[PDB]
Amino acid sequence: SINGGIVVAMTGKDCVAIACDLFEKIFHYGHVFLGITGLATDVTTLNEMFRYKTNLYKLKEERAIEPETFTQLVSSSLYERRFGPYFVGPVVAGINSKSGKPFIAGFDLIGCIDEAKDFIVSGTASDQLFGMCESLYEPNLEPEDLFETISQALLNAAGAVVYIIKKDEVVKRYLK
Amino acid sequence: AGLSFDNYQRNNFLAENTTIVGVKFNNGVVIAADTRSTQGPIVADKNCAKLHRISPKIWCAGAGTAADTEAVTQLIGSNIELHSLYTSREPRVVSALQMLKQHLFKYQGHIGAYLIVAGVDPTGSHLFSIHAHGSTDVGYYLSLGSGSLAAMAVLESHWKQDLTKEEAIKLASDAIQAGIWNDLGSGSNVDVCVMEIGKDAEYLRNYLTPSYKFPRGTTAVLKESIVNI
Amino acid sequence: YDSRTTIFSPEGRLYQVEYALESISHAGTAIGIMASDGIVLAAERKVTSTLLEQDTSTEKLYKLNDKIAVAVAGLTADAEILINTARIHAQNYLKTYNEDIPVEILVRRLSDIKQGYTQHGGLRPFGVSFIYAGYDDRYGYQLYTSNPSGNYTGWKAISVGANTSAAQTLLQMDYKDDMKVDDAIELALKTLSKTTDSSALTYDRLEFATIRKVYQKIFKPQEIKDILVKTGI
Amino acid sequence: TSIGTGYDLSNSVFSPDGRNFQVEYAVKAVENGTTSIGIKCNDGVVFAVEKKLLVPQKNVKIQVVDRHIGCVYSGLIPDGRHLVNRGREEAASFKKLYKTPIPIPAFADRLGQYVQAHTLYNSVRPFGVSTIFGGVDKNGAHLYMLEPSGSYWGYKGAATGKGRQSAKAELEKLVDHHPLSAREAVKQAAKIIYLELEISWCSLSETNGLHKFVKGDLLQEAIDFA
Amino acid sequence: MFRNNYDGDTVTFSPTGRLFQVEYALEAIKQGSVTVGLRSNTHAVLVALKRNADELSSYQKKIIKCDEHMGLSLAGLAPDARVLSNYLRQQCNYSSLVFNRKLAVERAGHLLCDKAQKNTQSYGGRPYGVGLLIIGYDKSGAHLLEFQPSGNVTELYGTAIGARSQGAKTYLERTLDTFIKIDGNPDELIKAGVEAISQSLRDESLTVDNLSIAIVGKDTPFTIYDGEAVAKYI
Amino acid sequence: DRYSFSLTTFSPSGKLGQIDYALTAVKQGVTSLGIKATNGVVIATEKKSSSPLAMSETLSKVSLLTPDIGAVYSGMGPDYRVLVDKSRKVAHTSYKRIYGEYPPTKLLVSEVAKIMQEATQSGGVRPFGVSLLIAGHDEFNGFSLYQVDPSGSYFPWKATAIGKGSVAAKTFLEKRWNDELELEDAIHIALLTLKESVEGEFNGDTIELAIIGDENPDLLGYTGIPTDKGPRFRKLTSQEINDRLEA
Amino acid sequence: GYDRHITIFSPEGRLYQVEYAFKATNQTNINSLAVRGKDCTVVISQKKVPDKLLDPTTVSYIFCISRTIGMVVNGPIPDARNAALRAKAEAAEFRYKYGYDMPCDVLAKRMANLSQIYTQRAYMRPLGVILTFVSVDEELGPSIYKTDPAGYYVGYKATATGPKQQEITTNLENHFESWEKVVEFAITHMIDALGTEFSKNDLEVGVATKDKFFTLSAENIEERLVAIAEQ
Amino acid sequence: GEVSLGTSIMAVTFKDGVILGADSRTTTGAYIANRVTDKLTRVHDKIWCCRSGSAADTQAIADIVQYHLELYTSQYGTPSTETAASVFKELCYENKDNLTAGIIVAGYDDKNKGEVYTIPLGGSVHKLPYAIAGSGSTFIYGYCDKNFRENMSKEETVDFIKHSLSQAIKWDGSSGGVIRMVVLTAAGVERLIFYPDEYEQL
Amino acid sequence: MNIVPQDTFKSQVSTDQDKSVLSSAVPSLPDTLRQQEGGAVPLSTQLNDRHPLESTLKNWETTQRQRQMEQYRQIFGIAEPMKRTMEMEIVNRTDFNPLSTNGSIHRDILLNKECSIDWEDVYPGTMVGDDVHSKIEKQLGI
């Protein structure tokens, strides 16, 4: 089944990583990347909704949404369906265009914000990957050391894709 | 309009398939909380900041459904901001208490936010608790969360009338430490906010704070591509 | 008979809508030109003065979508109400079909909106006419206009506002449908330069855009000035 | 200027002098009605009016709104009937709520608010009636006259209708003579009307504080006095 | 002249307080055909001269029945007569259904008074322009009410409404001393009514088609006599 | 009664009469002006009072819309007050409650313009008889100044003035404005323009002036969140205004 | 045209129907005064009752709106009583919603916004009254706010209202321990401005104190007048 | 798990007026969430009530009553205690299916000179010389019924309320803390408080 | 005199209860194309197992308003609720705007919601029947 699976995001120096075990579950709205686990119907509905919202944002503001503002947009859009939520675990990752601050966040079904600075995991096998990330992770990884850390952690969580995000470029990679 | 119900029957069918304290003192009130956050047995985030601001001198901390406490706290902070602008007056803590309890009452307890609201206003310092059903009680000291019993034990052992600012901060941080040590849900750092009747509120983030990297090339890259945006 | 938009006159004509049409005769001229390889949009900034922020007064050309832009003549408040309605419609269409809205469907929706305000008595017509430039993979590059009456027409080149008759005569003499975008830019600039009531077509009095290649660009005043001096105005 | 052409053909319009000419015309409607007086005693109040196939025991002009409070109106019959019935509803609801007779000032307030509300919108017209009402009360007895504007005041005596001016003058002379018993006030009301008769009164001593009709022997004695 | 300015609606008074728009609805009764009503103490009788539009047409039904105790007579606007009759009969019914009590005639009249008053004060509608005579018999005995579309109701021993009602009403004013005593002999009260309605006739005479009668009393539910049943009284 | 005819309509000339008459009501209003500096914006106006017994401290013609955005008006004060209330409410509801941050000045101006425009379509209300100068700062658009007219049209300005003095003030600004002003220079030019525009007594109690500038942490009311930003809107006290006038 | 019957703009940019609603406020000849002490606010109104038949007990234009707020109305009594009921309901609703006693200026702001509604809806006439609210606020102390039919309001150090309001205002400008002294001061200045030596029933007086608002009774106005006549 | 006002509350009419007394414990199960809560709620200057049942529904009801009665007072002057009891009755009854509230209303009123109304969970209203309610009242029905007397003095009524509430506190776990009382008389409102060391040694 | 909305369930149901969306061919059944609800499949019988809160949260404000009018009737009499309601209906009936979702600026003042936010404000939340003409026809009752 294509429902569920796992998404993880992780912070480096001047970079972030986001990865999932794969239909697709990582989306991007300009320079802000949203990973969503859960029901694939709800993943698709969230993708359509946040595409709508961020297109209207970009049209009204003449400006691409910043990851912190997109995080607040995701939070408020999830809470709107406080009763009968989407069965999803979204994760946002990105870098602020002005400050270059690498940013990650993750949410519950109703948009509580973790905003943890080190790493965020969601979905199936979350406690296994929490243990992996805690053990493997070290702060201030280089972009390629960050790639190795995220990709190895994901492979040991249980066919994967990795985005390495710089301020000015993004590298997309795949894993068996 | 409002909070949607539009997947209630759907999600039903599919399902068929912390320590916080407030401490009033001789010229103010101290509110403090731990900074652990947990999902199930798992620490989702250490150093989570649990002290919310309703107004410059009205601050809040909550238990129950975190998203609910956040949403209601930011709604009431918006209403308090707008009312202060409308009346050109520094907002009263009794006004926040009133509108917060009337909001929670409107939702008949289905919005599961339990809160301690502390502040100073032109009429003095105030400290209140609010329950998700919309029931309130005033106090001179309060505790909330899974560690509420340990913190209340400390407050009741050491609280006294006419605490000073420093003695009140000490008492509050001792009660949070007792929570951290005795409750599993509490842990990591202690946050404190100090409101004095004549003074700017003094927020004190983390007032108390009680290799395996693999070599490059380890992971089997399958292929590469450039995504541009 | 003219007191309200819901009353036919004895001649069978809706004076209130003819007055909404006449309102545009006082808006600065907008012009649009469709080329073999793109579309040009240009407009006069008739409301101008040295204390106005020309660099941020994007005030007649508005993108509604990727691959679609509008040029506005008439009441800017009504213009931005309709622009935001059209943006919402285009995003609803993309959300529903996962395809970019066809330009004609958007023009039709906006013209039906403008028409309805002519038919209920508590509403006045919108005192605004749009030129629509866009691209879709059904009809390719296509260019439209619509009136306060809520009728619309497809055009290869069109002018709206004060001196529309003169501009359209100059287009009818000079336009040829195998010209390129770089040719259409210069034909637009020539037309506006001969049409404007100003002593000279200074770059601050212009707003300019093109849809070509699919990408759209709204020119900043620097490249507007460069395109002007390249044309020789 | 009494006509106000150009500011009169619609309700709620202020003229340039701030006058609401539709209200002045509704006042002028009252000036056509049956001359009616009320008199306030030391102990109570009394009302009198100047007024063949009609059933005579059913042809009555003074309206008891409640046993507590008596009412008489002049001007448009249907407007008077409507205002009377609205007041009787307000009295009955007050009594149901607070288990006490409606204080005469509270009743007066409610009626003034109801009439005044008809001055706010072009979709309604002012009542074409001026009402005199009053009764014994917890605080004594009160006499009010409610103009079609919704303006009302307490009075020691009031008169409305075509004869209102002479009635006012004689009732003012009466007040100047007594700076009254229910009996004497009844006699003077009969006189003022004579200057068919129907009278009613409300006093603590002589009607137990209820409103009652003055009929039979005392009516004939009042006619003899007149 | 100046009346033309202040007569456009029920919501403008004139500079003289007239409220012309209600006066015009009271004049609308004068366009109606004559009907007479009278009662004794034990019985109440209505008499009506019906009309027809053309010799090829039937006569219009001018009298109605709220229930077995009360009934009604119409003069004036047919649409408003229809409205008010339906209203009076829906009140008679609701009263019976909820309380199982015959609606008092006086109460029914007051209900009509109230309904009629509303249209005199709101802008959008118009006054009902129709007069009604109500008769009934209840615990309080025989009743006759005259309703005017100004929203005025009077209980009377006898009256007439319609174009020449003044003649019949003058006749009744001369003779009320006689008909009110007619107790237990209703035939003489009916014949007195037909006599009263024999005044105010013009170029016409009472006939079994054009004349209609009804009666109610202590021993007699509301019955309508029309056609050959009227020949007993012509 | 289900419909009410449009109160604002086009004249045969194509001009919407009520819009012209609202702009005339604006022209009748007391002078107000605003000036972009490189490092701030000034907005200023006369506190005309109907009596010396009125409390000038209650004649709040300049009002905060957001910590970074402020407004002033000329014309019908009650309309301005209702528009301020609605603009604050919409700044919270539409934007702060969705994105967790205050709107940029451009979008709050657009929201006010939308609110003002719809009074021009309704058949129940007249248009608002005010034009607003809205000055603000945005993290990306920087300092900005917009003039909103009764039509709900708005344009960005370097400097502008509205009301009785509007034309003479705009000429004085056009001769005196330059792209290098500091906020103290803009404040001086504003005060000189208003001195030239005001009628009668010109003092720190007959004027009020607000600025958009750097953050004021002493106006934030709390300490200890170092990323958190003091308000950039600041009304000058009449003491400070008098200390400017002594220059 | 329509600008005469409804509150739309005239070509001058003027709402004639609101200006005419201002002229309605002087259709009664009463004039009134409000002044502030250190810790009290006093409002003086004339009570013109020449009609022998009229009972001056009932003739009051001063309304107690809240425990701590009173207002005097200038203009026709029906609209004054309407405004009174409106303000009173709004003060009670504010207390219910926000948990503290409504400030005088917040009530003034509310009533001014309502008047703006009436100045902007075509089908609602302006109310035709000027409202002067007096209170002792717990933050601002004694304060006076006056509200116009236009929906303008401003705070005042003192006010006058009615046909002669300029004379009183100018007398106050000429001028500029317990509330009884402030009442006597205000009465003395009313006398000096208007030139009428008041009878005990020619006046009505309202006092806002730190704790409550109250109206003087005729025997209290009598003793105030006596205490004036001692000087 | 809503907060319920586990309570012992007791109002007693006496020669000069009425005294309304309460404990000050409130409990969430076995936990005392507040041990010095003030259960006495002023709805008007001389009209006071005590609340039982859920804290949220009773607080909402009492706030709506205080609104209604302030509006009334602004229109008609001071209400009678019977008016207040009527408002309480109407709110408790028309919401009886949704809200669980029981109220003792006590108030002084110069025409009636002090009255007590109890509104049990059903929304009946009963005027009584004294009323007891809450968990702890059950243990003191016999004491109050034996020891109550009509037209007690103030001091005798204070003693009586102290002895009753002290026994309720003794036997009921859900009630305790300090005893709080308001004395309502023509002289004014007087707050009283009695501490455990002042009532346990009885 | 209600706090929580009591009357909150439809007492009677019919295929014709929903007006303005009826089949022109057979004026007894819904128009499932014009409903645009995803077919007939939202059959009216599926109005079952509603969230317990929904039926109270939808009409909470209406209930508060009705209680407020009742209180004004009890204390001030029939004049005050009548005045309030007439004002409110004037505002509602004169504000026609088919393009704006936003609430009227004067409606908020009358409701005393000038300085209040609720989730209905924050979260104000189609191939057929969305057109301006459908709104015109609803509003005029065409």
Short mmCIF file of N, CA and C in Angstrom, two decimals, chain F residues 3-5 7 18 20-22 24-25 28 48-60 76-79 81-82 85 88 119 122-130, chain G residues 6-15 36 109 111-114 116-117 119-123 143-145 150-160 168-169 172-173 176:
data_model
loop_
_atom_site.label_atom_id
_atom_site.label_comp_id
_atom_site.label_asym_id
_atom_site.label_seq_id
_atom_site.Cartn_x
_atom_site.Cartn_y
_atom_site.Cartn_z
N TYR F 3 -34.21 44.30 -2.69
CA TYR F 3 -33.11 45.03 -3.31
C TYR F 3 -33.12 46.49 -2.87
N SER F 4 -31.93 47.08 -2.82
CA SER F 4 -31.76 48.52 -2.69
C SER F 4 -30.91 49.03 -3.85
N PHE F 5 -31.41 50.03 -4.55
CA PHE F 5 -30.71 50.56 -5.71
C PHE F 5 -29.36 51.15 -5.31
N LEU F 7 -26.54 53.52 -4.60
CA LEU F 7 -26.51 54.94 -4.29
C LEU F 7 -25.43 55.67 -5.08
N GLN F 18 -20.89 60.23 -6.42
CA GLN F 18 -20.59 60.12 -4.99
C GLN F 18 -19.09 60.02 -4.74
N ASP F 20 -16.79 61.59 -6.59
CA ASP F 20 -16.32 62.97 -6.72
C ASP F 20 -16.66 63.78 -5.47
N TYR F 21 -17.84 63.55 -4.90
CA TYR F 21 -18.25 64.32 -3.74
C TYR F 21 -17.52 63.88 -2.48
N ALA F 22 -17.17 62.60 -2.37
CA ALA F 22 -16.30 62.16 -1.30
C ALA F 22 -14.90 62.75 -1.43
N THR F 24 -14.32 65.58 -2.77
CA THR F 24 -14.50 66.97 -2.37
C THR F 24 -14.53 67.11 -0.85
N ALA F 25 -15.21 66.19 -0.16
CA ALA F 25 -15.18 66.17 1.30
C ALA F 25 -13.76 66.00 1.82
N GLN F 28 -11.99 69.26 1.53
CA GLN F 28 -12.43 70.16 2.59
C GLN F 28 -11.75 69.88 3.93
N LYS F 48 -6.86 70.35 14.89
CA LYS F 48 -7.93 71.33 14.98
C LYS F 48 -8.93 70.90 16.04
N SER F 49 -9.27 71.82 16.94
CA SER F 49 -10.25 71.56 17.99
C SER F 49 -11.39 72.57 17.90
N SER F 50 -12.60 72.10 18.21
CA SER F 50 -13.76 72.98 18.24
C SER F 50 -13.77 73.90 19.45
N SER F 51 -12.96 73.62 20.46
CA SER F 51 -12.88 74.47 21.64
C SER F 51 -11.51 74.28 22.28
N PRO F 52 -11.04 75.26 23.05
CA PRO F 52 -9.88 75.02 23.93
C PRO F 52 -10.19 74.15 25.14
N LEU F 53 -11.47 73.90 25.45
CA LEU F 53 -11.82 73.00 26.54
C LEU F 53 -11.75 71.54 26.14
N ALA F 54 -11.67 71.23 24.85
CA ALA F 54 -11.49 69.85 24.42
C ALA F 54 -10.11 69.34 24.83
N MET F 55 -10.04 68.05 25.14
CA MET F 55 -8.79 67.40 25.51
C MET F 55 -8.08 66.94 24.24
N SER F 56 -7.05 67.69 23.85
CA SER F 56 -6.30 67.37 22.64
C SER F 56 -5.69 65.97 22.70
N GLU F 57 -5.38 65.48 23.90
CA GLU F 57 -4.86 64.12 24.05
C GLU F 57 -5.85 63.05 23.63
N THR F 58 -7.12 63.39 23.43
CA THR F 58 -8.10 62.45 22.90
C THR F 58 -8.35 62.60 21.40
N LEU F 59 -7.80 63.65 20.77
CA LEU F 59 -7.92 63.82 19.32
C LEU F 59 -6.83 63.01 18.62
N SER F 60 -6.95 61.69 18.74
CA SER F 60 -6.03 60.76 18.09
C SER F 60 -6.38 60.67 16.61
N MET F 76 -13.95 62.93 7.28
CA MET F 76 -14.93 62.53 8.29
C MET F 76 -14.27 61.61 9.30
N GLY F 77 -13.93 62.17 10.47
CA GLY F 77 -13.31 61.39 11.53
C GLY F 77 -14.02 60.12 11.92
N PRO F 78 -15.36 60.12 12.02
CA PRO F 78 -16.04 58.86 12.37
C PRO F 78 -15.80 57.75 11.36
N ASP F 79 -15.76 58.10 10.07
CA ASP F 79 -15.47 57.12 9.04
C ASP F 79 -14.05 56.59 9.19
N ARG F 81 -12.37 56.44 11.99
CA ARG F 81 -12.34 55.61 13.18
C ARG F 81 -12.87 54.21 12.89
N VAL F 82 -13.99 54.12 12.18
CA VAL F 82 -14.55 52.82 11.82
C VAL F 82 -13.61 52.07 10.88
N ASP F 85 -10.72 50.68 13.00
CA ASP F 85 -11.17 49.48 13.71
C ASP F 85 -11.20 48.28 12.77
N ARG F 88 -7.51 47.21 11.60
CA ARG F 88 -6.89 46.42 12.66
C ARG F 88 -7.46 45.01 12.70
N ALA F 119 -18.02 50.01 -0.26
CA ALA F 119 -18.98 51.07 0.02
C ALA F 119 -19.34 51.87 -1.22
N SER F 122 -22.21 49.25 -2.88
CA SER F 122 -23.42 49.03 -2.12
C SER F 122 -24.48 50.08 -2.46
N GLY F 123 -25.73 49.64 -2.46
CA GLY F 123 -26.89 50.51 -2.49
C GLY F 123 -27.43 50.88 -1.13
N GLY F 124 -26.78 50.44 -0.05
CA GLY F 124 -27.18 50.81 1.29
C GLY F 124 -26.38 51.93 1.93
N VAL F 125 -25.13 52.12 1.50
CA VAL F 125 -24.24 53.08 2.14
C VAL F 125 -23.67 54.04 1.10
N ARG F 126 -23.37 55.25 1.55
CA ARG F 126 -22.47 56.15 0.85
C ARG F 126 -21.02 55.68 0.97
N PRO F 127 -20.16 56.08 0.03
CA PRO F 127 -18.72 55.92 0.23
C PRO F 127 -18.22 56.67 1.46
N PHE F 128 -17.03 56.26 1.92
CA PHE F 128 -16.38 56.95 3.02
C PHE F 128 -15.81 58.28 2.55
N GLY F 129 -16.04 59.33 3.33
CA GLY F 129 -15.58 60.67 2.98
C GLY F 129 -14.19 60.99 3.48
N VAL F 130 -13.28 60.02 3.43
CA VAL F 130 -11.92 60.19 3.93
C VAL F 130 -10.93 59.62 2.92
N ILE G 6 -31.83 61.82 2.32
CA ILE G 6 -30.98 60.75 2.82
C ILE G 6 -29.56 61.27 3.00
N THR G 7 -28.80 60.57 3.85
CA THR G 7 -27.46 61.00 4.26
C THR G 7 -26.40 60.56 3.24
N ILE G 8 -26.58 61.02 2.01
CA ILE G 8 -25.54 60.94 0.99
C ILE G 8 -24.86 62.30 0.86
N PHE G 9 -23.72 62.32 0.18
CA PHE G 9 -23.00 63.57 -0.03
C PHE G 9 -23.74 64.47 -1.01
N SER G 10 -23.77 65.76 -0.71
CA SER G 10 -24.08 66.79 -1.69
C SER G 10 -22.84 67.15 -2.49
N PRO G 11 -23.02 67.86 -3.61
CA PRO G 11 -21.85 68.29 -4.39
C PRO G 11 -20.83 69.07 -3.59
N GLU G 12 -21.26 69.78 -2.54
CA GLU G 12 -20.33 70.45 -1.64
C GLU G 12 -19.50 69.48 -0.82
N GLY G 13 -19.82 68.19 -0.84
CA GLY G 13 -19.21 67.24 0.07
C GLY G 13 -19.81 67.24 1.45
N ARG G 14 -21.00 67.80 1.62
CA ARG G 14 -21.63 67.97 2.92
C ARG G 14 -22.77 66.98 3.07
N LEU G 15 -22.89 66.40 4.27
CA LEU G 15 -24.06 65.62 4.64
C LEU G 15 -25.06 66.55 5.30
N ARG G 36 -15.16 69.46 35.98
CA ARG G 36 -14.40 68.45 36.69
C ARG G 36 -13.77 69.07 37.93
N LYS G 109 -17.07 55.98 22.74
CA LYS G 109 -16.61 55.45 21.46
C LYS G 109 -17.66 54.53 20.83
N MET G 111 -20.97 54.56 21.32
CA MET G 111 -22.12 55.34 20.88
C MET G 111 -21.77 56.20 19.67
N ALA G 112 -20.53 56.67 19.58
CA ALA G 112 -20.09 57.40 18.39
C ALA G 112 -20.04 56.50 17.17
N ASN G 113 -19.60 55.25 17.34
CA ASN G 113 -19.60 54.33 16.20
C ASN G 113 -21.02 54.00 15.76
N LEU G 114 -21.95 53.85 16.71
CA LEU G 114 -23.35 53.70 16.34
C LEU G 114 -23.86 54.92 15.58
N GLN G 116 -22.05 56.82 13.77
CA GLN G 116 -21.47 56.73 12.43
C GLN G 116 -22.31 55.83 11.54
N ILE G 117 -22.76 54.70 12.09
CA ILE G 117 -23.69 53.84 11.35
C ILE G 117 -24.85 54.68 10.84
N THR G 119 -25.05 57.81 10.36
CA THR G 119 -24.59 58.79 9.37
C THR G 119 -24.21 58.17 8.04
N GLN G 120 -24.14 56.84 7.95
CA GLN G 120 -23.65 56.20 6.73
C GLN G 120 -24.67 55.29 6.06
N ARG G 121 -25.54 54.62 6.82
CA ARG G 121 -26.65 53.90 6.19
C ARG G 121 -27.66 54.89 5.63
N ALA G 122 -28.08 54.65 4.38
CA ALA G 122 -29.05 55.53 3.74
C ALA G 122 -30.39 55.52 4.46
N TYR G 123 -30.81 54.36 4.97
CA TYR G 123 -32.18 54.18 5.46
C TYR G 123 -32.31 54.39 6.96
N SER G 143 -13.64 62.46 34.13
CA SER G 143 -13.51 62.70 32.70
C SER G 143 -14.88 62.99 32.11
N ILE G 144 -14.88 63.81 31.06
CA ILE G 144 -16.10 64.19 30.35
C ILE G 144 -15.87 63.92 28.87
N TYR G 145 -16.80 63.20 28.25
CA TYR G 145 -16.78 62.96 26.81
C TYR G 145 -18.14 63.29 26.23
N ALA G 150 -23.08 63.54 14.43
CA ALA G 150 -22.15 63.12 13.39
C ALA G 150 -21.33 61.90 13.80
N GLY G 151 -21.40 61.48 15.06
CA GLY G 151 -20.51 60.46 15.56
C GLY G 151 -19.11 60.93 15.87
N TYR G 152 -18.89 62.24 15.93
CA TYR G 152 -17.68 62.78 16.52
C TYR G 152 -17.78 62.74 18.03
N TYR G 153 -16.66 62.43 18.69
CA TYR G 153 -16.57 62.59 20.13
C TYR G 153 -15.15 62.99 20.50
N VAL G 154 -15.04 63.76 21.58
CA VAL G 154 -13.76 64.16 22.13
C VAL G 154 -13.93 64.34 23.63
N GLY G 155 -12.84 64.18 24.38
CA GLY G 155 -12.87 64.49 25.79
C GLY G 155 -12.75 65.97 26.06
N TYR G 156 -13.26 66.39 27.21
CA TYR G 156 -13.33 67.80 27.56
C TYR G 156 -12.91 68.01 29.00
N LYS G 157 -12.32 69.18 29.26
CA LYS G 157 -12.11 69.63 30.63
C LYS G 157 -13.40 70.16 31.23
N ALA G 158 -14.20 70.84 30.41
CA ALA G 158 -15.56 71.22 30.75
C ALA G 158 -16.33 71.42 29.45
N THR G 159 -17.66 71.40 29.55
CA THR G 159 -18.50 71.59 28.39
C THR G 159 -19.67 72.50 28.73
N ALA G 160 -20.23 73.11 27.68
CA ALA G 160 -21.60 73.58 27.69
C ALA G 160 -22.30 73.12 26.41
N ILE G 168 -21.40 80.21 28.08
CA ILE G 168 -20.86 79.40 29.17
C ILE G 168 -19.43 78.98 28.86
N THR G 169 -19.17 78.56 27.62
CA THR G 169 -17.82 78.12 27.27
C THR G 169 -16.82 79.26 27.47
N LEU G 172 -16.17 79.82 31.09
CA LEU G 172 -15.26 78.80 31.59
C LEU G 172 -13.82 79.09 31.18
N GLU G 173 -13.61 79.55 29.94
CA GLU G 173 -12.27 79.93 29.52
C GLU G 173 -11.76 81.12 30.33
N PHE G 176 -10.72 79.39 33.32
CA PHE G 176 -9.50 78.70 32.92
C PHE G 176 -8.61 79.60 32.07
#
